Amino acid sequence: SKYMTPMQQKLNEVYEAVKNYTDKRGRRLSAIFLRLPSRSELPDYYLTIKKPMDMEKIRSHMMANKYQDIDSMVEDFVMMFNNACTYNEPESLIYKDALVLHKVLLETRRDLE
Ligand SMILES: O=C(/C=C/N1CCc2c[nH]nc2C1)c1ccccc1O
Secondary structure: OOOOOHHHHHHHHHHHHHHHOEOOOOOEOOHHHOOOOOOOOOHHHHHHOOOOOOHHHHHHHHHOOOOOOHHHHHHHHHHHHHHHHHHOOOOOHHHHHHHHHHHHHHHHHHHOO
16 A cells, blocks of 8 residues: 555656746746745636646645556646636746747657557
8 A cells, every 4th residue: 555556656656747847948837837826826727727736736636546547647738738828828937938848748759558
């Protein structure tokens, strides 16, 4: 019960791949995505985006063992990036960084096949 299953280890690897990805300048693109702005700070976010997601929530689902496979986790990452790209303009850094991380996620999944 203290030993992680292979699926649990794979989930953790994918999550850390996204979280730890660094660009050529050593920036971790995940930083903005770890925790959403609060409902008090950014109400127009929550009136627009119906299914809010951040990496804190993904990590929480992962620790409660709510992900029974890798695609379930990928789906929540992709919802997060889709939301970021819906709320923020295409010229924005957050939009751009979401595209890159979505690519990093898909590469990671493919490499762990
Ligand atoms: O879009 C996200 C963040 C957007 N910001 C722009 C507006 C703003 C005001 N204060 N802080 C911010 C951050 C986001 C973050 C985490 C996960 C998913 C997201 O869509």
